[PDB]
Amino acid sequence: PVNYYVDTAVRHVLLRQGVLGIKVKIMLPWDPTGKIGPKKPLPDHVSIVEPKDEILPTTPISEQK
Amino acid sequence: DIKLFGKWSTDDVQINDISLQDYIAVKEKYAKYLPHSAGRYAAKRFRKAQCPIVERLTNSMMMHGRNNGKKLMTVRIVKHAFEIIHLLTGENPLQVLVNAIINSGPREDSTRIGRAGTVRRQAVDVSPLRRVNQAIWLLCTGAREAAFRNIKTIAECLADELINAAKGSSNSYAIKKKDELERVAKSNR
Amino acid sequence: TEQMTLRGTLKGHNGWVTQIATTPQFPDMILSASRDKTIIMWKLTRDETNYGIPQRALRGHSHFVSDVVISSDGQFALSGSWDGTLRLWDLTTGTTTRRFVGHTKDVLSVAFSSDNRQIVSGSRDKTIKLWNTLGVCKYTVQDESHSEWVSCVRFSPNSSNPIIVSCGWDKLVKVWNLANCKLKTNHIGHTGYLNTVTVSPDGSLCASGGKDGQAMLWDLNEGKHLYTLDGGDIINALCFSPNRYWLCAATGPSIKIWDLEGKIIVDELKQEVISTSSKAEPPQCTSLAWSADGQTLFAGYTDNLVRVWQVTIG
Amino acid sequence: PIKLARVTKVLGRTGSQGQCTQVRVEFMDDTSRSIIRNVKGPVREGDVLTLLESEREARRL
Amino acid sequence: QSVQVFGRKKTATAVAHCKRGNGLIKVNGRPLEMIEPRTLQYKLLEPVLLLGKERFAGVDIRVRVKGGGHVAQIYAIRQSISKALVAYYQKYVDEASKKEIKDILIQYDRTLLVADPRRCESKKFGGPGARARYQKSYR
Amino acid sequence: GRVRTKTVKKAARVIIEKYYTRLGNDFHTNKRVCEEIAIIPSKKLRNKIAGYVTHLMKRIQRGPVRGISIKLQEEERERRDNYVPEVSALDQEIIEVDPDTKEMLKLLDFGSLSNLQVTQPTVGMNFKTPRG
RNA sequence: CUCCCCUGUGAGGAACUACUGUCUUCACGCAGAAAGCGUCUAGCCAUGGCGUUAGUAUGAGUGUCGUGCAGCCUCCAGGACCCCCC
RNA sequence: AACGAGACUCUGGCAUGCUAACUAGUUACGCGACCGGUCGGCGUAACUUCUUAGAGGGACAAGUGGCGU
């Protein structure tokens, strides 16, 4: 996942003293692409949809339409 | 009917010991036509308890380097060895494998105790599977050492070492190393 | 004045029996679709050692076959399967004449009409599909057909205007009218998912059952709640007797033959005598089939067997 | 005398290098005598061991 | 009257074609007894002698085998003919006689109707073989 | 060694706790239940979680599970627990009692109770464990 | 304190030559030991390996001579039995 | 609760169910040959078991029985 989920950049600054190399690692959040948020989710992540509220039955009812 | 190498009969043979009756194969079902089944008996623990005994003698005959990968060398050699055996003793050659296994296997054996370089052994006793295995080892190794250069066929020399391992003579390299093990077992106790 | 006895046991199968389908045209043969991907053709030789012996094992499926129904004639059969494929089988040549696709989920149930040109199926895609004998799909109902899976679909063989009854996991039993492709009724009695809907040859009595454990008998023509039967565990299968007016409920541990006029449970069918394996769950009853004969019962199990029941009349 | 023996239980593995198995011995003579014993190679319960010295007892390596 | 199967062992593939006939069974243009190891003769007729000759009297199998090694190919023809007489008995015969054939072939060798999934692993760097490695030395 | 990740067991815990009515003791049943109820990537995750939902149900029908609270098994354990024998175990025609207990009752004017039976005091005094 | 089923080698017979299998004697090749004596190795130390005793002392088998050993009948015994002791 | 372990990607094993193939073959029918077959010999329709490679199924310690607070 780290392939599509994060972005790494390495550079060299050139100064009197020498060169300083640098690394910047950035991680993107999840879901639909806004130019960010790569669609496919972490293989670990498990999302549970909350149960849609269901009417508790009282007495049998038959409705013809 | 199931006939070994086309001319033998497996179901008529007999086992005289209870320890080796539960392990040694080719009596009831396991009897096959040919030794090479290319099955996996090293898959799980004691799954190699159930593979055909003739195949077991077969597997151990490749045991030195140049012969290693070539299995068929053995199902050749085990072929002519049996057909030789029947000519000498005149009994079911698969009775001769049973008796050689039973007699060649150790009984008691020594386990090395001490610090490295000083061998001081204590006597313990062999497990049935271990008995079978060590026995067959002894058979194949006795055959090799005996057949290196006498210009004997390994067919001839294994029939030799097998019949001799069956009778109980000191001719067999097998019975020799066994007798040493048991004697060291006596030394310690 | 009647009792019931265990006649014989049928092993053709390496897995569960999902649905059993009998036929009037041949009281001798049965069709058993199983968890092993196989549709086995059962020949009854009625001998001493074996009550029946398998004839034709049909493999068109990469997956389990959920339900099977036969034509009124001894040739054609039909099979739904979870790989998402419905199929038209020839029991005579043992090959597949027609294939039905266009389901994106498992095919949970399929119903063949009394007129033998129509197909009405329902699926875990929450779809009720209308199929033609040549493979072509007519009308797809997304209408609120259900908010959950369709577990069973059954035709109604009645003289009054034709009706198809489907039961969902959303606890609704829905009634639909053919040729208008319309939703004519909503039946809500239930707690928990629905498993099977059956429709008597009368057309008047339809039975539905589910996790609630209570058999619900509904009136199809009038659209009125009729009766409520109390019982344990899960109703897996329900089948009506053509001539005996008996509603046979299939629950996992026990099968219950109900007499609907007197509200009397006729016989409760369970047998296990063993003390060592008694800690186990008794093998469930997956399906139920009533032969057109009325004397012979054919039931599938989680024991990967087909056990049959015979009626002792006094 | 030569005797026979039965495996009642497997307890642990005795050894420097973890060689021997330490197993429990019933006598096949239908006697109830119970002796612990050291055995080499693979052992599963129920097996029969042949003892050349049958009065000997097990020590910890 | 026609049924087709395939045997598999390692890289060796067999293809068995079963038609109604006199009982002729040939492999890539030659009978059962012309095959390369003659030592391995008896492993080839194993289902035959197990199934009886009567059930092969009405079955003509032409077998085409390419791939793998010599030994593997005989396991391949074994597989092909066994799977052939089980899969033919389904379509053109009843399931009772297929159960007879199967109960006879299964209790002897499980490799008759099944194949061994196992096939060669990949040797990787740092060693001569799959696991096996190069020597190392201190001092 | 086959052992379930935190993911597996936590997920099957919450799935069971919310959806307890929809699950059943069959594997593929709840496998297809969880392909819907939750959103899981891949396969080997899905299958494992479902396996644990199942396993956990086979432990639920036995009795109370440490991880989950459902009102349905609270209610079935309200049935199971509620019990009573035809008569109480607190009803005996003769209940035996020590002289002093009789004294303490005599303080409360209950020395008139019928059911009592005064039993002989024990003569030795050793209630104590022999230290060492 | 026994009696009577099977094992032995103690005495009488047939057989023994023809029957078969084993111990005698000669040519044959194959494995093949030790008491010890030395050496090496375990930090020091053989209870081990290796050298020399020696390819000795031996034993398993194939072909020669046995007038053998037998196998078939009896007992004299020895053990399983019983009892008995518990 | 978070990273590391796992999950994940890459490879092998399953599919006589699906999607198909003249740049892979199969079955069938012709011609060809030598004594009904044998043939990598030559061409046409038949299809996917072989041969490929996509989709998606399949295994989750699952089922039963033992050791386990």
Measured CA to CA in angstroms, residue D57 lies from B128, D22, D30 at distances of 20, 11, 19
Amino acid letter, residue F131: R
Nucleotide with minimal C1' distance from the CA of B145 is G31
Closest residue of chain D to B105, computed from CA coordinates: D50
> Which residues from F are below 8 Å from C233, CB to CB?
none
Q: What are the extents of the domains in chain C?
A: 7-314
Interchain pair C234, F25: CB under 8 A? no
Question: Which of F1, F65, F57 lies closest to F27, judged by CA?
Answer: F57
- What is the side-by-side strand order in the sheet with C95-100? C65-70, C76-81, C85-90, C95-100
Could you tell me the resolution of this structure in angstroms? 3.9
Nucleotide with minimal C1' distance from the CA of F4 is H6
Three-state SS for chain C is CEEEEEEEEECCCCCCEEEEECCCCCCCEEEEEECCCCEEEEECCCCCCCCCEEEEEECCCCCCEEEEEECCCCCEEEEEECCCEEEEEECCCCEEEEEECCCCCCEEEEECCCCCCCEEEEECCCCEEEECCCCCEEEEECCCCCCCCEEEEEECCCCCCCEEEEEECCCEEEEEECCCCEEEEEEECCCCCEEEEEECCCCCEEEEEECCCCEEEEECCCCEEEEEECCCCCEEEEEECCCCCEEEEEECCCEEEEECCCCEEEEEECCCCCCCCCCCCCCCEEEEEECCCCCEEEEEECCCCEEEEEEEEC
d(CA C298, CA F93): 59
d(CA C296, CA C290): 7
State how far residue C212 is from chain F, nearest Cα, in angstroms. Answer: 10
Domain that holds residue E30: 1-139
The coordinates were experimentally obtained by cryo-EM
DSSP codes joined into one string, E52-116: -STTTTT-EEEEEEESS-HHHHHHHHHHHHHHHHHHHHHHSS-HHHHHHHHHHHHHH-TTTTS--
User: Which of C167, C174, C186 would you mutate first to test chain A, the one with the most A CBs within 10 A?
Assistant: C186
State how far residue B122 is from chain E, nearest Cα, in angstroms. Answer: 35
Q: In the structure, how far is the CA atom of residue D10 from the C1' atom of nucleotide H67, in angstroms?
A: 13
Q: Which CATH number fits domain F1-61: 1.10.8.290, 3.30.1330.180, 1.25.40.10, 1.10.60.20?
A: 1.10.60.20
State how far residue A32 is from chain C, nearest Cα, in angstroms. Answer: 24
Question: Which of C166, C165, C172, C219 lies closest to C192, judged by CA?
Answer: C172
Q: What are the extents of the domains in chain D?
A: 1-61
Q: B1-189: which CATH topology?
A: Ribosomal Protein S7 (1.10.455)
* The total number of structural domains that make up chain E: 1
d(CA C30, CA C21): 7
CATH superfamily, region C7-314? YVTN repeat-like/Quinoprotein amine dehydrogenase (2.130.10.10)
Task: Tell me whether C218 touches chain A (CB under 8 Å).
Answer: yes
Chains B and F touch (3+ CB pairs under 8 A): no
CATH number of the domain that E136 lies in? 3.30.230.10
- Residue B60 is classified by DSSP as G
d(CA B128, CA B19): 6
Q: What are the extents of the domains in chain B?
A: 1-189
Give φ, ψ of C154 to 5 degrees.
-140, 130
